Design a protein around this ligand. Structure first.
Ligand code: PRO
Length: 162
């Protein structure tokens, strides 16, 4: 039940570290998946992956470590897993939430919000929150574009539990 972190680089240059708390008491399965993808314990995970879709004033999206473009990724349970619950709302910036392709299609892709996104409530499972490094989140956000195409390669150079 440890917190997790990402060390971020921009075109290979260190940008800083983002630390997160996961809500295991509410969404234990979803939190465990993300934690294990941070440690890399199953032989795959977020290390070396990048943020493929970044939209300023909305969110930063990553986690596709199989295809790097929004079409891939996988969970520690299989290709996909069910929406655990929608108890937690997208009620502030800095929340971790699962990206998906409709109901019960969670894999490894996730997003970090940069604004309140209440319209996503009931559609995406919220499972964690930034506890340090919101300045790094804002730096990544600044590399986005309206289409979501990033202006630079924003990589999770290292990740794990802390
Ligand atoms: O990528 C998108 O735009 C939607 C909204 C956040 C998660 N999936």
């Amino acid at each position: 039940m440890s917190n997790v972190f990402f060390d971020i680089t921009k075109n290979g240059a260190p940008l800083g570290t983002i630390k997160f708390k996961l809500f295991d008491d509410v969404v234990p399965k979803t939190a465990a998946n993300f934690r294990a993808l941070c440690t890399g314990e199953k032989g795959f995970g977020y290390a070396g992956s990048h943020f493929h879709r970044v939209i300023p004033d909305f969110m930063l999206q990553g986690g596709d470590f199989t295809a790097g473009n929004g079409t891939g990724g996988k969970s520690i349970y299989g290709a996909k897993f069910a929406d655990e619950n929608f108890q937690l709302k997208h009620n502030k910036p800095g929340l971790l939430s699962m990206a998906n392709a409709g109901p019960n299609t969670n894999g490894s892709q996730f997003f970090i919000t940069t604004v309140v996104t209440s319209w996503l409530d009931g559609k995406h499972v919220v499972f964690g929150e930034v506890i340090d490094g919101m300045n790094v989140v804002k730096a990544i956000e600044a590399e986005g574009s309206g289409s979501g195409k990033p202006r630079s390669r924003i990589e999770i150079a290292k990740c794990g539990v802390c």
